[PDB]
Amino acid sequence: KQRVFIAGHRGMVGSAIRRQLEQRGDVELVLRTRDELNLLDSRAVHDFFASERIDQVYLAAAKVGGIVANNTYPADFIYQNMMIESNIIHAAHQNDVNKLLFLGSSCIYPKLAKQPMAESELLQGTLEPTNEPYAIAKIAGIKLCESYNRQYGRDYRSVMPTNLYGPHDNFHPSNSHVIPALLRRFHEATAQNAPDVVVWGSGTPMREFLHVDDMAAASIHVMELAHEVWLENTQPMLSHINVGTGVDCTIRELAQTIAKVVGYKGRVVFDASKPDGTPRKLLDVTRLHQLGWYHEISLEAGLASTYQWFLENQDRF
């Protein structure tokens, strides 16, 4: 029976992986809350890895935030993520954990990358300023993995997810991520019966979204793939695998779909006097598809179920 440590099991992605691994007895979960184990503490982390018998590690712990947070607390974002990665990856190796899955991020790719973005797009150009500190910490995490794989013959894999959404997301008004922000706004506009909802921009830019449950499934899939199969579809110094749908949709389509899901009857209005971001941003998921994994949750279905979760848990935001 495999003993799996899911770091950051309370977070959005961490909890999703947990929900799925809990539904099978060939795995035994070892979980620690931030109060039980502070991942920033090296000694604490090494002690934990020395005391427990861990077979696999899902590194889903991180200091995550929106546009305001990343620009307001840059030092916290680069430092905490660098330490959490270093502590876990080093401790795992020191205590013979051979399997580990590192979760990166799509905001790690160059601002002006070629679309759709293949894995080789990594380090090909300057990063988006807002995400720079966080992005550097994440890239360093991938290279730590590749470096341990090379030097010690470890099996530390990594996946790069696209924009995620689903239960346990930050539905707070402070969150800048489009899906949870719009679900919230359309929910209130519907409740207060507002004549319209104004969204900044033209609505023409194209984005990609993946439901967190699909994300968890793909993660477990990549983690459990045969080592020979994984080596065959990656390179030692370009080992990360993009995880997404490969399908993009306009912000207009997204907003209009959310309006429908929520039962909003007013008008959705795009204020084109405000600037748009990059015209298009989506991942090339060829590598993942060749590894035999395809997403199951469509946008409409995922938004409807996420809204349902939001309804049962709104007294938390």
Angle (CA) 30 26 309, round 5°: 65
DSSP string over 34-54: TTT--TT-HHHHHHHHHHS--
Judge whether 4 and 58 are in contact, CB under 8 Å: yes
Is the previous residue joined to 116 through a cis bond, with omega within 30 degrees of 0?
yes
* Least gap, CB of 27 to ligand NAP (angstroms): 20
Ligand-binding annotation for 180, yes or no, is no
Q: Which does 242 bind (CB under 5 to 8 A by kind): a copy of itself, ligand NAP, none?
A: none
Residues 65-94, interacting with a copy of itself (CB under 8 A): 67-68, 71-72
Phi, psi of 100 (to 5 degrees): -150, 140
Among residues 161, 166, 246, 302, the one that binds ligand NAP under rule CB under 6 A: 161
The listed partner (ligand NAP, a copy of itself, none) that binds 95, CB under 5 to 8 Å by sort, is none
303 counts as binding a copy of itself under rule CB under 8 A = no
* Position 44 contacts ligand NAP (CB under 6 A): no
Residue selected from 70, 87, 106, 239 as contacting ligand NAP according to rule CB under 6 A:
106
Helix, coil or strand: residue 251: helix
Q: Dig out the tokens for 220 from the structure.
A: 């477990």
Q: Under the criterion CB under 6 A, does residue 40 sit at the interface with ligand NAP? A: yes
Spacing of C-alpha 244 from chain mean position: 10
Name the active-site residue from 134, 148, 156, 264: 134
- Residues identified as active-site: 134
Applying CB under 6 A, the residues found at the interface with ligand NAP are: 8, 10-14, 34, 38-40, 60-64, 84, 103-107, 161-164
